[PDB]
Design a protein around this ligand. Structure first.
Ligand SMILES: [Mg+2]
Ligand SMILES: [Mg+2]
Ligand SMILES: [Mg+2]
Ligand SMILES: [Mg+2]
Ligand SMILES: [Mg+2]
Ligand SMILES: [Mg+2]
Ligand SMILES: [Mg+2]
Ligand SMILES: [Mg+2]
Ligand SMILES: [Mg+2]
Ligand SMILES: [Mg+2]
Ligand SMILES: [Mg+2]
Ligand SMILES: [Mg+2]
Ligand SMILES: [Mg+2]
Ligand SMILES: [Mg+2]
Ligand SMILES: [Mg+2]
Ligand SMILES: [Mg+2]
Ligand SMILES: [Mg+2]
Ligand SMILES: [Mg+2]
Ligand SMILES: [Mg+2]
Ligand SMILES: [Mg+2]
Ligand SMILES: [Mg+2]
Ligand SMILES: [Mg+2]
Ligand SMILES: [Mg+2]
Ligand SMILES: [Mg+2]
Ligand SMILES: [Mg+2]
Ligand SMILES: [Mg+2]
Ligand SMILES: [Mg+2]
Ligand SMILES: [Mg+2]
Ligand SMILES: [Mg+2]
Ligand SMILES: [Mg+2]
Ligand SMILES: [Mg+2]
Ligand SMILES: [Mg+2]
Ligand SMILES: [Mg+2]
Ligand SMILES: [Mg+2]
Ligand SMILES: [Mg+2]
Ligand SMILES: [Mg+2]
Ligand SMILES: [Mg+2]
Ligand SMILES: [Mg+2]
Ligand SMILES: [Mg+2]
Ligand SMILES: [Mg+2]
Ligand SMILES: [Mg+2]
Lengths: 100, 124, 114, 146, 54
RNA sequence: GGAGGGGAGUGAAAGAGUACCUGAAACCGUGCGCUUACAAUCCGUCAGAGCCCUCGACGUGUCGUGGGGUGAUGGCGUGCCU
RNA sequence: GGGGAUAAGCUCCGUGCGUCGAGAGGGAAACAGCCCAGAUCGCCGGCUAAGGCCCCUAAGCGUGUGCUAAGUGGAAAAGGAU
RNA sequence: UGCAUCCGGUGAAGCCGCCGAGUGAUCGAGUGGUGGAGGGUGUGGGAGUGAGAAUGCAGGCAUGAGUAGCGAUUAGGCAAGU
């Protein structure tokens, strides 16, 4: 039992009870969220057509909000005296899928 | 008020050295030449932070082509049929499935083939 | 963990690499073989190293009171010390500066039961 | 996190391919594809996923056109004027296996992982091989019609 | 000529890596009631009892 | 033989012993974990197995929004200032 | 366009020319100046331009209709040839 | 430098690590080990105020390397002694 959740312009294969790292989305930690679907699998049978994809539902609850790890940026052009630096830290949300 | 230039310089010396930690030979020892490769290695970081997406998409496409051929169809046809059926799954999930559930991959390829029109050479 | 006694000779008048050459022959051997190899190794660096090992064995026997026959060199190494510095004339009047090296000798001998 | 193949988890298999009346280029291309493992859906460049492929009766390989007397395999020993000149006819007459071996070494990734993959290929001249204890599976190259 | 650069630490030590001393096996001789240590270079003289060993 | 050194004592401290507060970096070692003897090169970055150790749910090792060290192998890769 | 010999990666002009200079990305192997196209940052998402789709290397060893035997393709003329 | 005045032998500055945080130069009434006597929140004020380059200056240490050389054309061996 694994499904594909289309969120943050991405899709992920996730199984019930799993936890995933998805982009930040406005929701208080500990609440619940529902999402359209792109594919659901249960043993043999497979549901793929976009109609069933949009007709089934995936329910999960947001665990916490995470700022990722520091990632440095260093632009530079040799011999031309251009020296540019900047840090960045993206914010992420973690989901623990509940049921399908 | 003359200011003696000790602590400030040592701070950045150490910061650059630490950031360079783990490089080859004297290149993790000499600040005057660690800077060279701190700056380089981070330039490579900048460039490949996008090169990686291209490379990974390449790998996914290759895996998908392999799976389609093992299922008796060419990757381009798989994509065409999938689109014509109007599926919204992308090649990352395609590849992960193809290596995880061959049965689901088979079902998906049947869907694509069925959605594939009768004649492929039709000018329309 | 075994009782370790240490004994070193500092500012001793020889090059670090030339002491290390001799020292590499003895690392990890028992004191008997250490003494034998040192005495029958014709290297001027040997004499200082043999002196130091004899001193270390005496130190262990006296201060700690351990049987010499049970002793094996735990660790041994030579570190460059302060260097006397001299000037030595050379042709065409230009003067070149001599670096009279000097290295320390450290030898710590431990006990390893048979 | 996508999938990458483990060290020993990767699986091999053995195939035997006769070369009688086969086009050299097409045979080489198919052999290289199978060798690298692109057919498998476990392909990952850092670690080979190929299969030991054994080629039999390599002396009957055929080439198109008048190449049989106008193909020019080259090499240089290493000293000035040490250039060595040979043709397909001479190569087949004196050492046949080298033809296919060179053809596929050209195709394989010229890095050292490719130099390694090169190992798992073996080519013989006659229709027999001492590798009968590995139950190779006959593998006739075919195309997906389209 | 001269060098073009510094040879790496590793390169120098590698070149050094085969220049070292060696230890032989000693020999004892039972003469005059005592056993002393002499390389077999000396064994016969050791037995006879004239070799100047302290 | 002395130099030198190890104990004992002084002292709050002798990793304050007169070469004496603090003792850094180049530099040279010992030991430990890992890598390396089919490998062509601004020496890294992106992937990345394995091994080592670390931590929590869970038994003898498997999972887990795992870490640090190493990095087998492959994609890209022509230092810096003038 | 002038000069040079319609030679130079030549020189001298005009371009409400373009680009580099002062521009990263992809393509032409490599290559600022040629082709496509403007890098606020991140994403292990999708669609495309130039150029490509047998393998190295991602993509049709595709569809149908013809030409070529020269490895022409993958350096060149006056002329010559059932 | 000015300040409400505080921080500290229950460990300041300095040194070496670790953690977390800011887009940056950084920061942490944030700490682990050495050190054993001074620092200083905030808001202003003034600057000998920020180093990789200048064949820079002074000091220390590198490598060529345990390599070249050990400074003549007269030259030693041995006994015994210290
Ligand atoms: Mg500038
Ligand atoms: Mg590394
Ligand atoms: Mg001697
Ligand atoms: Mg006391
Ligand atoms: Mg000193
Ligand atoms: Mg002091
Ligand atoms: Mg190693
Ligand atoms: Mg090897
Ligand atoms: Mg190469
Ligand atoms: Mg390189
Ligand atoms: Mg590269
Ligand atoms: Mg390269
Ligand atoms: Mg013109
Ligand atoms: Mg000019
Ligand atoms: Mg521009
Ligand atoms: Mg450009
Ligand atoms: Mg390019
Ligand atoms: Mg932009
Ligand atoms: Mg390549
Ligand atoms: Mg391909
Ligand atoms: Mg086509
Ligand atoms: Mg076809
Ligand atoms: Mg036709
Ligand atoms: Mg041509
Ligand atoms: Mg012609
Ligand atoms: Mg004519
Ligand atoms: Mg105190
Ligand atoms: Mg303290
Ligand atoms: Mg403290
Ligand atoms: Mg103190
Ligand atoms: Mg202060
Ligand atoms: Mg103020
Ligand atoms: Mg201020
Ligand atoms: Mg100044
Ligand atoms: Mg400086
Ligand atoms: Mg500068
Ligand atoms: Mg300078
Ligand atoms: Mg030198
Ligand atoms: Mg010589
Ligand atoms: Mg000489
Ligand atoms: Mg002389």
């Amino acid at each position: 039992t694994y499904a594909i959740v289309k969120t943050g312009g991405k899709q992920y294969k996730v199984a019930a009870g799993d936890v995933v790292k998805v982009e930040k989305l406005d929701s208080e930690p500990g609440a619940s969220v529902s999402l359209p679907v792109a594919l659901v699998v249960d043993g043999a049978n497979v549901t793929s057509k976009a109609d069933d994809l949009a007709k089934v539902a995936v329910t999960a609850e947001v665990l916490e909000h995470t700022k990722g790890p520091k990632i440095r940026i260093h632009k530079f052009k040799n011999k031309t005296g251009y020296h540019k630096r900047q840090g960045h830290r993206q914010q992420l949300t973690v989901l623990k899928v509940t049921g399908i | 008020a003359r200011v003696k230039r000790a602590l400030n310089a040592q701070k950045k010396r150490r910061t650059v050295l630490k950031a360079s930690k783990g490089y080859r030979g004297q290149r993790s020892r000499l600040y005057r030449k660690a800077k060279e490769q701190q700056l380089h290695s981070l330039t490579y970081a900048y460039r490949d932070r996008r090169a990686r997406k291209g490379e990974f998409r390449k790998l996914w496409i290759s895996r998908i082509n392999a799976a389609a051929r093992a299922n008796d169809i060419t990757y381009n046809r798989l994509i065409q049929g999938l689109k014509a059926a109007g599926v919204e799954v992308d090649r990352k999930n395609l590849a992960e499935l193809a290596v995880s559930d061959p049965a689901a991959f088979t079902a998906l390829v049947d869907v694509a083939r069925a959605a594939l029109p009768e004649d492929v050479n039709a000018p329309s | 963990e075994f009782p370790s006694a240490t004994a070193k000779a500092r500012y001793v008048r020889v090059s670090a690499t030339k002491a290390r050459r001799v020292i590499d022959l003895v690392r990890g051997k028992s004191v008997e073989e250490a003494l034998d190899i040192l005495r029958w190794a014709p290297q001027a660096a040997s004499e200082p190293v043999a002196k130091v090992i004899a001193s270390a064995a005496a130190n262990a026997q006296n201060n700690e009171g351990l049987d010499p026959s049970t002793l094996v060199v735990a660790t041994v190494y030579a570190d460059e010390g302060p260097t006397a510095k001299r000037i030595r004339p050379r042709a065409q009047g230009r003067a070149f500066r001599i670096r009279k090296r000097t290295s320390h000798i450290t030898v710590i001998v431990e006990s390893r039961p048979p | 996190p996508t999938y990458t193949p483990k060290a020993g988890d990767t699986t091999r298999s053995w195939y035997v391919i006769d070369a009688s009346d086969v086009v050299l280029g097409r045979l080489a291309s198919a052999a290289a594809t199978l060798l690298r493992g692109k057919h498998k859906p476990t392909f990952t460049p850092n670690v080979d996923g190929g299969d030991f492929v054994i080629v039999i009766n390599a002396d009957k390989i055929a080439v198109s056109g008048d190449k049989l007397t106008k193909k020019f395999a080259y090499r240089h020993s290493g000293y000035p004027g040490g250039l060595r000149k040979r043709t397909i006819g001479e190569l087949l007459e004196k050492h046949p296996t080298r033809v296919v071996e060179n053809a596929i070494i050209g195709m394989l990734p010229h890095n050292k992982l490719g130099r390694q993959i090169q190992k798992k290929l073996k080519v013989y001249a006659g229709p027999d091989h001492p590798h009968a204890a590995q139950q190779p599976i006959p593998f006739e190259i075919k195309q997906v019609a389209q | 000529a001269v060098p073009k650069r510094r040879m790496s630490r590793a390169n120098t030590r590698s070149r050094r890596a085969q220049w070292k001393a060696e230890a032989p096996g000693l020999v004892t001789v039972s003469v005059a009631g005592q056993q002393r240590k002499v390389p077999r270079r000396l064994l016969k003289a050791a037995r006879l009892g004239l070799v100047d060993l302290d």
